[PDB]
Design an enzyme around this catalytic site. Structure first.
Site, short mmCIF file in Angstrom:
data_model
loop_
_atom_site.label_atom_id
_atom_site.label_comp_id
_atom_site.label_asym_id
_atom_site.label_seq_id
_atom_site.Cartn_x
_atom_site.Cartn_y
_atom_site.Cartn_z
N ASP A 141 0.74 -1.17 0.15
CA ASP A 141 0.13 0.03 0.15
C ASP A 141 0.99 1.32 -0.02
O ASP A 141 1.62 1.45 1.15
CB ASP A 141 -0.91 0.10 1.27
CG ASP A 141 -1.90 0.97 1.25
OD1 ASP A 141 -1.69 2.16 0.15
OD2 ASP A 141 -3.08 1.09 1.72
N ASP A 293 -4.04 -3.73 3.62
CA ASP A 293 -4.28 -2.90 4.72
C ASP A 293 -3.86 -3.33 6.26
O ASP A 293 -3.77 -2.90 7.31
CB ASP A 293 -5.76 -2.28 4.91
CG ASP A 293 -6.13 -1.31 3.69
OD1 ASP A 293 -5.11 -0.43 3.29
OD2 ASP A 293 -7.56 -1.45 3.33
#
Ligand SMILES: Nc1ncnc2c1ncn2[C@@H]1O[C@H](COP(=O)(O)O)[C@@H](OP(=O)(O)O)[C@H]1O
Ligand SMILES: [Ca+2]
Ligand SMILES: [Mg+2]
EC number: 3.1.3.7
Length: 354
Positions: A141, A293
């Site tokens: 990410d 995440d």
């Protein structure tokens, strides 16, 4: 094991952490040209793309065959937009190499020179892997907490290595993190671009100022005995977790202290010993969490001595299911098991009472 991988992950995150720290104010100011809306209405900025480009290019220059699951894609970006990504990369290189160059480490090479608009597009799109149960892949990410980034608040640059569905390595850059904000002590050099946290499974969890990233301090969760003294970690954005149900859990456990911030910086504060329970209850049960995440935080929290599960069943998270987690919600804590199970069983009971 994984010594080279750890070095690459750390330096890649380090360079991207400087870029994103530096951009933060110009993106916010020019957030009419620097910010794109995705198919789910979520934002993406020049910074997200630039960070993904730096990190994947470093991975590829060091490990040419390696697979990467990255959040972003170059599809549809204009040449004008891509030239801005390239410009931010080269502007950051000029600051970074004066000041923070690491000897005998390459970010680019002959095969992946990162020179043209076409190079940028190709590198971003090497993040198109879909993951799965067998073998090795990176999980990225490039800006976790883009809404926090845009608010001038917290965000994180997150990279992990998964092997056979298990997170083996994690590295989280927290470029805007100031520990004294949480009442805790900051280390020499933190002010330029925050902190890096990292861990390899079996080998412990560590942190260092981003500008340093050579001297590493070992970290561990704390152990308070009574929930009444504990501190939760929760997001800011009301659409990302069920705040009112989280409040119900806190009230039931007599918790009166909470820290709200965006990104996996939350896992870093837990692992450092500055709070006790990370709550992320699902608002809609149809949502499937993205692996990027949670993956870097999973191994960092484990190696710091904590526990990481879903929010309902109290089972471990399974990073071998593709791009998403099949379970609902996420809860992490300092442990011990009895504390963790109290929290998750409370969460279960609250959700089932809807
Ligand atoms: N409805 C939802 N439920 C859970 N997470 C969501 C969500 N919508 C978006 N998110 C994700 O929340 C991730 C971490 O959230 P937080 O910062 O609140 O802890 C974000 O980082 P991104 O900026 O990468 O989207 C984003 O992917
Ligand atoms: Ca993101
Ligand atoms: Mg995210």
């Amino acid at each position: 094991a994984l010594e080279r991988e750890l070095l690459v992950a750390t330096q890649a995150v380090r360079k991207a952490s400087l870029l994103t720290k530096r951009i933060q104010s110009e993106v916010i100011s020019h957030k009419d040209s620097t910010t794109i809306t995705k198919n789910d209405n979520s934002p993406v900025t020049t910074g997200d793309y630039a960070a993904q480009t730096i990190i994947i290019n470093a991975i590829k220059s060091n490990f040419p065959d390696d697979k990467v699951v990255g959040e972003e894609s170059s599809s549809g970006l204009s040449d004008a937009f891509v030239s801005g990504i390239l410009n931010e990369i080269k502007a950051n290189d000029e600051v970074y190499n004066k000041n923070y160059k690491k000897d005998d480490f390459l970010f680019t090479n002959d095969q992946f020179p990162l020179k043209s608009l076409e190079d940028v597009r190709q590198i971003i799109d090497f993040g198109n892997y879909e993951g799965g149960r067998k073998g090795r892949f990176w999980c990225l990410d490039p800006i976790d907490g883009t809404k926090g980034f845009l608010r001038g608040e917290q965000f994180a640059v997150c990279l992990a290595l998964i092997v056979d569905g298990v997170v083996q390595l994690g590295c989280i850059g927290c470029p805007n993190l100031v520990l004294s904000s949480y009442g805790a002590q900051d280390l020499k050099g933190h002010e330029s671009f925050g902190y890096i946290f990292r861990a390899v499974r079996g080998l412990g969890a560590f942190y260092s100022p981003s500008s340093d990233a050579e001297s590493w301090t070992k970290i561990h969760v704390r152990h308070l005995k009574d929930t009444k003294d504990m501190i939760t970690l929760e997001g800011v954005e009301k659409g990302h977790s069920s705040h009112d149900e989280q409040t119900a859990i806190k009230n039931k456990l007599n918790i009166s202290k909470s820290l709200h911030l965006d990104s996996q910086a939350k896992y870093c504060l837990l692992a450092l010993g500055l709070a006790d329970v990370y709550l992320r209850l699902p608002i809609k049960l149809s949502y499937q969490e993205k692996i990027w995440d949670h993956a870097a935080g999973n191994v960092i929290v484990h190696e710091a001595g904590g526990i990481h599960t879903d929010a309902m069943e109290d089972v471990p998270l399974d990073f071998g299911n593709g791009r998403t987690l099949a379970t609902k919600g996420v809860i992490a804590s300092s442990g011990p098991r009895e504390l963790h199970d109290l929290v998750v069983s409370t969460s279960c009971d609250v959700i089932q009472s809807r």
